[PDB]
Amino acid sequence: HMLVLVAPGQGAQTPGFLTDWLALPGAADRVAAWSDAIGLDLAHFGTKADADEIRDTSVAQPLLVAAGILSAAALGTGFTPGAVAGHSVGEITAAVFAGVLDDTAALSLVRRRGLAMAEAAAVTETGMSALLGGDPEVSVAHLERLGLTPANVNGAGQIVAAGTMEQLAALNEDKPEGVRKVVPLKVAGAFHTRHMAPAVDKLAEAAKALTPADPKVTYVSNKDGRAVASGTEVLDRLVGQVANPVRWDLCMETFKELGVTAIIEVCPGGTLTGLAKRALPGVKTLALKTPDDLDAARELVAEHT
């Protein structure tokens, strides 16, 4: 048996999704301490804030990490997964699970991650758009020829293009063969492209205040789907990833190579679990959406750990 614990990225959060989790004894207290540490009312954005407030990239990133750490903590009340990984921001969440970074240090890093990427996006008119349908390699060749970069390679043939708004518009007018729709994502800019270069500089400064430990659990990286044994290499990869494509496809290939038998996606789950059901047939999957999902999760943990 091999259980893989994964954490989601931007887009997974929805209004009021943290509500039930804050109701768990001690949860409001932990989140409040985190909020004071990063200067952001996490409880508010996870409970009362509407769509426009949580779409704020500087808010969404730390909120997602706190949700992942919180739900995982609840699920372990212990256990140790066979491996961990996450989608973009979810990588910071996974660093906590592997013991590379403690939670406050991670939330502090991701708070800076979100602000830095927002700022980088502001000095530019860029974005990201998902390609629905078509062939992944032909699609990549086409979008790249138009000047875009394959910011997200999520597996199951899914591709997300990123670049300037002009290029994204040219992509929609001249779509790759077989692509039915080019859907713009709800993001501030071309994340995971060179357009985030200034975000790397800012994020690297925040990484200076950290002292990462070597992962205690196998840590799979978005850069190339490889397992990283060094804590400093984990951190360097996190800092650089804001400007590098997300190869979630390779991460899933690695889960296969590891003989994964079950995958649990922390709160707010659904997105990575949906991908797993497509690219990882025969693998049990469970997404944590509310505390009521915990009992089923514990059973899955018990039989796969």
Which residues belong to the active site?
88, 192
CA nearest 235: which of 202, 255, 210? Answer: 210
**In sequence order, which residues have a C-beta less than 8 Å from that of residue 277 and are 6 or more positions away?**
285
Nearer to Ni ion, 187 or 234 (CB): 187
- Binding residue count for Ni ion, defined by CB under 5 A: 2
Cβ 47 to Ni ion shortest distance, Å: 14
φ and ψ at residue 4, rounded to 5 degrees: -115, 125
Site string for Ni ion, 225-264 (x = CB under 5 A): ----------------------------------------
Q: Amino acid identity of 107?
A: L
Query: Cα(121)–Cα(113) distance, rounded to whole angstroms?
Result: 12
Q: Amino acid identity of 270?
A: G
H/E stretch holding 278:
helix 271-279
Site string for Ni ion, 170-189 (x = CB under 5 A): --------------------
H/E stretch holding 232:
helix 231-241
Nearer to Ni ion, 52 or 295 (CB): 52
Tokens of 146: 């138009």
> CB-hemisphere CA count at 13 Å for 245?
22
Site string for Ni ion, 26-65 (x = CB under 5 A): ------------------------x-x-------------
Nearer to Ni ion, 40 or 272 (CB): 40
* Per-state percent for the chain, helix, strand, coil, to nearest 5: 50, 15, 35
Cβ 304 to Ni ion shortest distance, Å: 41
Cβ 267 to Ni ion shortest distance, Å: 22
φ and ψ at residue 86, rounded to 5 degrees: -160, 165
Query: Cα(60)–Cα(10) distance, rounded to whole angstroms?
Result: 7
Cβ 118 to Ni ion shortest distance, Å: 17
Cβ 59 to Ni ion shortest distance, Å: 12
Q: Does 14 bind Ni ion (CB under 5 A)?
A: no
Nearer to Ni ion, 47 or 88 (CB): 47
Nearer to Ni ion, 52 or 292 (CB): 52
Cβ 45 to Ni ion shortest distance, Å: 11
Residue 188 contacts residue 125 (beta carbons within 8 Å) = no
CA nearest 270: which of 3, 8, 5, 4? Answer: 8
DSSP 195: G
Read out DSSP for 101-114? S-HHHHHHHHHHHH
Residue 66 contacts residue 106 (beta carbons within 8 Å) = no
Nearer to Ni ion, 59 or 297 (CB): 59
Binding site for Ni ion (CB under 5 A): 50, 52
